[PDB]
Design a protein around this nucleic acid. Structure first.
Ligand SMILES: [Mg+2]
Ligand SMILES: [Mg+2]
Ligand SMILES: [Mg+2]
Length: 127
RNA sequence: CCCGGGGGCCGGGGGCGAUACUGCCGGGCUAGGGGGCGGGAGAGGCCGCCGGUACUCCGGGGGUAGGGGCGAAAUCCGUUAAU
């Protein structure tokens, strides 16, 4: 008997956030971030930070009764980075090793169908 | 240098001629141009109605305490429940 849930992974260039919830996504069983598992702010987007956060969220979900999960990885969608950051792969790898039953792995980064004006002006981030 | 003769001194007018070229007058054409008909092409324009995701904000439910940012941080957001 497999109780199903969803692992949302937010992999940005500065941090990662793993939220494990029920299959409707309304009930949250666990939620970990890189700042909750890493000493300094410089290591939040580290694959180590994503790996240990995925471990902690997985043990919490297994302890609270979730044994199977789909995976939805994402980055900051719209006027930002349209790809998951550097910790999504490590997070899913730690999820797989934690003993949780994997369903479907999908990218759910929100895509603007046009858009809004992004930051940094018109000369870019360095001029 | 002076004398004598011819030429020019770029022009005006008169007379007699020529009609290729330009102009004028008349007639006729279709080669350029314009006006058409037909089937298509186009982010051409104005006007009206509608949608797509993204986004921000707001209200409620889940769930704690971080989030955001950077080369590193810090200001900043958050325990009136944030991400
Ligand atoms: Mg003489
Ligand atoms: Mg004279
Ligand atoms: Mg003289």
């Amino acid at each position: 008997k497999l109780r199903w849930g969803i692992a949302w992974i937010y992999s940005s260039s500065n941090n990662t956030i793993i939220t494990i919830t029920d299959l409707t996504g309304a009930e949250t069983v666990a939620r970990v971030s890189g700042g909750m598992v890493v000493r300094a702010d410089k290591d939040k987007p580290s694959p180590w930070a994503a790996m240990q956060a995925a471990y902690k969220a997985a043990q919490l979900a297994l302890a609270r009764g979730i044994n199977a999960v789909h995976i939805k990885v994402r980055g900051p969608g719209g006027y930002g980075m349209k790809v998951p950051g550097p910790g999504a792969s490590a997070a899913i790898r730690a999820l797989a090793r934690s003993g949780l039953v994997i369903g479907r792995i999908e990218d759910v980064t929100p895509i603007p169908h046009x858009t809004i004006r992004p930051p940094s002006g018109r000369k870019g981030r360095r001029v």
